[PDB]
Write an enzyme that holds these catalytic residues in place. Structure first.
Site, short mmCIF file in Angstrom:
data_model
loop_
_atom_site.label_atom_id
_atom_site.label_comp_id
_atom_site.label_asym_id
_atom_site.label_seq_id
_atom_site.Cartn_x
_atom_site.Cartn_y
_atom_site.Cartn_z
N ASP A 195 28.99 40.71 45.22
CA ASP A 195 29.16 39.27 45.40
C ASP A 195 29.50 38.91 46.83
OD1 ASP A 195 31.33 36.75 43.78
OD2 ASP A 195 29.82 36.57 45.33
N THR A 196 28.54 38.35 47.54
CA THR A 196 28.63 37.98 48.93
C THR A 196 29.34 36.66 49.16
OG1 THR A 196 26.53 36.78 48.93
CG2 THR A 196 26.40 39.13 49.14
N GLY A 197 29.72 35.97 48.09
CA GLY A 197 30.45 34.71 48.18
C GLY A 197 31.95 34.95 48.11
C1 TPV Z 1 29.68 30.88 40.24
C2 TPV Z 1 30.50 31.94 39.53
C3 TPV Z 1 30.43 33.18 39.90
C4 TPV Z 1 31.67 33.83 40.55
C5 TPV Z 1 32.57 34.63 39.62
C6 TPV Z 1 31.81 35.89 39.32
C7 TPV Z 1 31.49 36.32 37.97
C8 TPV Z 1 30.20 36.87 37.77
C9 TPV Z 1 29.78 37.24 36.47
C10 TPV Z 1 30.68 37.11 35.40
C11 TPV Z 1 32.02 36.72 35.63
C12 TPV Z 1 32.40 36.26 36.91
C13 TPV Z 1 31.26 34.43 41.58
C14 TPV Z 1 31.78 33.89 42.91
O1 TPV Z 1 31.22 34.39 44.04
C15 TPV Z 1 33.10 33.40 42.89
C16 TPV Z 1 33.92 33.10 44.13
C17 TPV Z 1 34.16 31.83 45.00
C18 TPV Z 1 32.89 31.06 45.45
C19 TPV Z 1 34.98 34.18 44.22
C20 TPV Z 1 34.75 35.45 43.67
C21 TPV Z 1 35.73 36.46 43.81
C22 TPV Z 1 36.93 36.18 44.50
C23 TPV Z 1 37.23 34.87 44.91
N1 TPV Z 1 38.85 34.78 45.73
S1 TPV Z 1 38.65 34.93 47.33
O2 TPV Z 1 39.96 34.68 47.93
O3 TPV Z 1 38.01 36.21 47.58
C24 TPV Z 1 37.57 33.67 47.86
C25 TPV Z 1 38.07 32.37 47.97
C26 TPV Z 1 37.20 31.34 48.36
C27 TPV Z 1 35.93 31.72 48.85
C28 TPV Z 1 34.90 30.61 49.06
F1 TPV Z 1 34.31 30.88 50.31
F2 TPV Z 1 34.02 30.78 47.95
F3 TPV Z 1 35.64 29.41 49.00
C29 TPV Z 1 35.47 32.99 48.50
N2 TPV Z 1 36.30 34.00 48.15
C30 TPV Z 1 36.24 33.88 44.77
C31 TPV Z 1 33.66 32.91 41.59
O4 TPV Z 1 34.73 32.39 41.53
O5 TPV Z 1 32.85 32.93 40.52
#
Ligand code: TPV
Lengths: 99, 99
Positions: free
Chosen positions: A25-27
Site C-alpha cells: 500500500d503506497t498510500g
Molecule cells: C481505501 C481503503 C483502503 C486502505 C485500508 C487498507 C485495507 C485494504 C484491504 C482490506 C482492509 C484494509 C488503504 C489505505 O491506503 C489507507 C490509508 C490512508 C489513505 C492508510 C493505510 C495504512 C495506514 C494509515 N496511517 S498512516 O499514519 O500510515 C497514514 C496517515 C495518512 C496518510 C494519508 F496520506 F493517506 F493521509 C497515509 N498514511 C493510513 C486506509 O486507511 O485504508
C-alpha cells in the site's frame, strides 16, 4: 518483479518468525500489521486512515522479509483489518510506481 | 512517470474542471475523494478502511484526469482524510508496482 493492479497487490512477508500475507500500500506512510508479539519495547501511538483512528503499538528497527527481500524499519501493531506494508519499508526494497 | 516513495505519491487530478491533489494508493480498490458535488444520481456504498467503515456516494462513469492520463470510472465521495486514487483507476492509466 513487476506487479499489475488488476488484483490486490498481495505479498508474503516474514516477521517474528511468522510467515504472513500483506498488502503493498503506497498510500500508507507506515506499515501496520494485525495484532502480534514483537520483541523489545514499544510506544503507544495513534494512526488514522479511512474510518478514523486506531491505537497501535510502535516497534522500531524491525527486520522484515518481503518478496525474499530484507528490510528493517518501524512496524506498528494494532487492530488493523488488514496487514499493510507502507512506504516506510517499500522504499527499502526499491519499490516504485510506473505508468 | 516513475514515482519513488520517500515522499507521499501525490499527483494533480483534473476533476470537474477543478485541479486537486490526490494520492496514488495500490492498497485501495476504489477511488475515494473528499466531499464534493458531481453530475448524476449516486448509489450508496459502505467502504472499510484501516480505522473502520464509512458510507460514501458512488458515482459511475466520471471523467478524471490523473497526471495527463484520461480515466473514466467509478468515484466514491465521502469523509476521507485525503483524496485517494485506487486500483480501479490505476489499472486504467496502466500503473504498476516495480521492484
Ligand atoms: C481505501 C481503503 C483502503 C486502505 C485500508 C487498507 C485495507 C485494504 C484491504 C482490506 C482492509 C484494509 C488503504 C489505505 O491506503 C489507507 C490509508 C490512508 C489513505 C492508510 C493505510 C495504512 C495506514 C494509515 N496511517 S498512516 O499514519 O500510515 C497514514 C496517515 C495518512 C496518510 C494519508 F496520506 F493517506 F493521509 C497515509 N498514511 C493510513 C486506509 O486507511 O485504508
Amino acid at each position: 518483479p513487476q506487479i499489475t493492479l488488476w488484483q490486490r497487490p498481495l505479498v508474503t512477508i516474514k516477521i517474528g518468525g511468522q510467515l504472513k500475507e500483506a498488502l503493498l500500500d503506497t498510500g500508507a506512510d507506515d506499515t501496520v500489521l494485525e495484532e502480534m508479539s514483537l520483541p523489545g519495547r514499544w510506544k503507544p501511538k495513534m494512526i488514522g486512515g479511512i474510518g478514523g483512528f486506531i491505537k497501535v503499538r510502535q516497534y522500531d528497527q524491525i527486520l522484515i522479509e518481503i518478496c525474499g527481500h530484507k528490510a528493517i524499519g518501524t512496524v506498528l501493531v494494532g487492530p488493523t483489518p488488514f496487514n499493510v506494508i507502507g512506504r516506510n519499508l517499500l522504499t527499502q526494497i526499491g519499490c516504485t510506481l510506473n505508468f
